Amino acid sequence: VLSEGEWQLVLHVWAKVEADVAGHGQDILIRLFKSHPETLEKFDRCKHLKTEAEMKASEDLKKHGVTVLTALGAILKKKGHHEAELKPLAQSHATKHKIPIKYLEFISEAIIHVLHSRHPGDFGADAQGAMNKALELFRKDIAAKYKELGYQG
């Protein structure tokens, strides 16, 4: 359980993300794909991309960054009361996309990296620790639902 103050730090920096969801989503996915290229294999429409400029020009990558950040922002705004939001996401990521928890760790790392890079004044130690706790809670809860669905990833 995060404190109310921790949730407010999470949501304060998330408002900054919402000023340009697509640009943030591009930076986060490009960071993920650069730092962990095996993750790029999961995206059929993006897996041929080679350079940073190609990734920034990609309409498919830009759309998918928005898909991810829209779902995650709704989850964060539930302040841990996210079972109904995780249920469809666990469903598809366990049984169709087959996204192991370690890949969710990689993308959480990329999110933290981009938020620190773009919003350092709203992402000091207090806010980083809160965001870390929020993403850890997301990964804990979705791992439990993965297993309920028969997926040990």
Q: Which residues bind ligand HEM (CB under 6 A)?
A: 39, 42-43, 67-68, 71-72, 89, 92-93, 97, 99, 103-104, 107
Question: Which of 72, 127 has the CB closer to ligand HEM?
Answer: 72
- Angle between helix axes 59-77 and 21-35 (nearest 10 degrees) is 110
Report d(CA 136, CA 41) in Å as an integer: 24
What backbone torsions phi and psi does residue 150 show, to the nearest 5 degrees?
Answer: 90, 10
The nearest distance, CB 62 to ligand HEM, in angstroms, is 12
By beta-carbon proximity to ligand HEM, the closer residue of 98 and 121 is 98
Provide the 10 A C-beta neighbour count for residue 92: 11
Going by C-alpha positions, the residue among 62, 57, 60, 77 that lies closest to residue 11 is 77
Q: What angle do CA 145, 149, 153 make, to 5 degrees?
A: 75
DSSP 79: T
State yes or no: 48 annotated in a binding site. Answer: no
> CB of 93: closest distance to ligand HEM in angstroms?
6
- In terms of CB distance, is 69 or 127 closer to ligand HEM? 69
CB of 98 to ligand HEM, least distance (A): 9
The nearest distance, CB 9 to ligand HEM, in angstroms, is: 18
Q: Is 93 annotated as a binding residue?
A: yes
Measured CA to CA, the distance from residue 120 to residue 36 in angstroms comes to 24
| Minimal CB distance residue for ligand HEM | 92
Known binding residues for O2 are 64
Known binding residues for nitrite are 64
Known binding residues are 64, 93
